[PDB]
Amino acid sequence: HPETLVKVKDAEDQLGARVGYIELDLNSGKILESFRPEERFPMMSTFKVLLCGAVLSRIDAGQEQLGRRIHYSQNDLVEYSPVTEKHLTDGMTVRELCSAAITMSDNTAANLLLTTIGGPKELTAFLHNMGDHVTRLDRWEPELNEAIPNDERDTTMPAAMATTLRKLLTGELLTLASRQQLIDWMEADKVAGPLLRSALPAGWFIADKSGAGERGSRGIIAALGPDGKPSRIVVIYTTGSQATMDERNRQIAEIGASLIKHW
Numbered sequence: 228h229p230e231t232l233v234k235v236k237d238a239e240d241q242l243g244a245r246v247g248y249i250e251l252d253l254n255s256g257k258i259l260e261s262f263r264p265e266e267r268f269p270m271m272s273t274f275k276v277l278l279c280g281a282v283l284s285r286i287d288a289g290q291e292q293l294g295r296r297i298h299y300s301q302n303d304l305v306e307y308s309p310v311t312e313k314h315l316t317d318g319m320t321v322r323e324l325c326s327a328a329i330t331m332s333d334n335t336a337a338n339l340l341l342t343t344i345g346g347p348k349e350l351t352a353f354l355h356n357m358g359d360h361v362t363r364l365d366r367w368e369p370e371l372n373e374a375i376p377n378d379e380r381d382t383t384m385p386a387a388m389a390t391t392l393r394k395l396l397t398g399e400l401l402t403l404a405s406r407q408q409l410i411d412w413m414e415a416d417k418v419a420g421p422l423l424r425s426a427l428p429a430g431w432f433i434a435d436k437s438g439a440g441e442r443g444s445r446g447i448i449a450a451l452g453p454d455g456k457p458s459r460i461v462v463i464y465t466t467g468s469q470a471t472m473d474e475r476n477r478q479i480a481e482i483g484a485s486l487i488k489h490w
């Protein structure tokens with residue numbers, strides 16, 4: 228809606244940074260609203276949904292199992308590993324690692340899962356093979372969050388990320404059971420959501436994944452709608468702002484409030 232576009236541009240002014248935005252119809256794929264749809268932004272932790280999509284694709288092909296238990300050591304642990312740091316002696320299942328990566332944004336969990344598929348270049352090959360010739364992962368946690376200006380590593384475009392998310396949640400790309408598992412991981416309760424979940428009223432469905440990086444990088448991908456069902460994809464990215472985390476949260480929340488108000 229035009230008034231949401233006015234708020235996206237106001238967010239640019241307040242952050243002193245570029246904001247990328249797109250709304251897709253979940254059923255038809257049609258673009259309802261866009262701003263900088265084909266400019267590149269750092270994915271940050273929003274890639275973890277694409278990762279678990281690649282993992283579920285291999286489960287569907289008989290090349291992986293949700294129940295397989297993986298053992299790791301102290302030397303695998305990177306910064307922010309609230310689940311993986313507790314399971315040094317007993318390990319974790321693929322199921323538990325995808326839950327920890329998407330729901331608890333566990334960085335070690337994302338690295339262990341990247342190891343299962345053969346690293347960042349194999350996530351890029353997965354995406355290339357289902358028709359996303361733009362989105363690319365090049366590095367591991369934590370250095371995929373560096374967000375150097377004009378560096379195309381670990382980047383997507385809003386339009387590419389939105390089309391890919393739609394194909395994972397509703398195509399024939401994953402099986403019915405794997406689609407449900409991916410959206411289930413994205414829907415699960417988190418301790419705090421100061422982004423789209425703060426603007427979302429009771430009765431609305433939201434399945435999302437948020438992102439933060441260096442140089443004021445911030446983002447979110449979401450399937451959401453009224454009446455307890457998703458009916459739209461929303462992708463929001465920003466990079467370059469010197470504004471506090473609180474100020475970046477508030478601007479994305481206000482884009483959400485406008486999206487909901489003018490649904």
Ligand SMILES: *C(=O)/C=C/N[C@@H](C(=O)O)[C@](C)(Cn1ccnn1)[SH](=O)=O
Pocket residue numbers: 271272273307331332417419437438439440
């Ligand atoms: C992606 O790069 C980060 C996702 N999760 C973050 C966030 O969105 O801010 C949270 C805060 C988890 N976290 C704390 C420290 N590092 N990650 S979660 O609450 O969404």
